[PDB]
Amino acid sequence: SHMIIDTSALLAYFDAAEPDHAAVSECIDSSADALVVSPYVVAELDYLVATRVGVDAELAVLRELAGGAWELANCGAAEIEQAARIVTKYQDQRIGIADAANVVLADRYRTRTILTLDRRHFSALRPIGGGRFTVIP
Template identity: 40%
Template structure:
């Protein structure tokens, strides 16, 4: 999970489900339940390219960081509820992403 995603997940959990799910997620992060991937310095240019290319979606920086990280790590599957964005974006390393669940 790219580090930029954490802020979005915490926000959504807190505003839509309340403090308890947010606290559990933070605890899971602390326990190492998720692999957290920092955004590499070279990723920022690709993130900007994706935001510019898909501006009509619009694709934001957080989603673009998911794409960029998946490209860098050659990951073809993305867990998301945002099928609209990720079904349109074409990664460099594959024809398309496999979207989960």
């Protein structure tokens, strides 16, 4: 019922020209899981699309995100505290708050399913409830 979405996958999904666009499209469209996007990922996506593509696309992306199809997650005090613990656990890997927060949100939404193209990076991380993350595609 839930899928956590990294910046990479959204870059691939919103851009037809990206090599991975199709593979990601088939995962998102025909999901039935709710689509979870961290605000940290929104930040990253905003910056990246803006600088590498330009403002028109930035606007397109923001408006789609606010369009209602997406679950826009909240990261509050508890979430940042726990995220900090996850960064701490992995600190040598310098994984950053986007990834950390995605781990946390994976537990919040009771899902092990992660949508990202950085597979090897995320596969070294472990779910808070134990087990293994499921990375798609």
